[PDB]
Amino acid sequence: HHHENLYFQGMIGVVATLKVQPAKAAEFEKVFLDLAAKVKANEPGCLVYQLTRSKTEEGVYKVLELYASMDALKHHGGTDYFKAAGAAMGPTMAGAPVIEYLDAVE
């Protein structure tokens, strides 16, 4: 049906493009890696959570993420450590994030 895009029932991919101030990259990476270790350790529904750096745009990062389900993604976005990390990261940002959700094909 035409509202199918709202809730894919399979795995959910994400490319999160983050624009970080280059001078604050070290700070950003430390907070992010600490978050990622928590995500991987605590969330069985998070299948991939991988920070990467752009090769061409200064201070740009792309996070590759994969979740088992919408339920796993909903949980992910609401944890106290996710919220704390976001608060710690915000001041390092140069611009608004661009998040793209994708339907994983299996």
Next chain:
Amino acid sequence: HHHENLYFQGMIGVVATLKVQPAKAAEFEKVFLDLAAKVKANEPGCLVYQLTRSKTEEGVYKVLELYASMDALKHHGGTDYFKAAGAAMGPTMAGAPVIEYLDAVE
């Protein structure tokens, strides 16, 4: 040094944006999923190999890929099954692929 971008010594992420003819999506997905099963089964250096569909652009797919090293990526691109799959997939394409390589942060 200034030529560092040429060879990241850690893990290599990829977002491969593929533009498929919508009418040939079923054909494309069958060939791609068959390829992905081979990749995952045969290549210990391939850590992630996940086909996803765009939620907004018709016939657009993004493959999320992660390799242990440049060596693992070099191997990946040269296998007989990768080459055979590419030949099978080509005729389904609507436009040129856009591949972005990323330095994984760990």
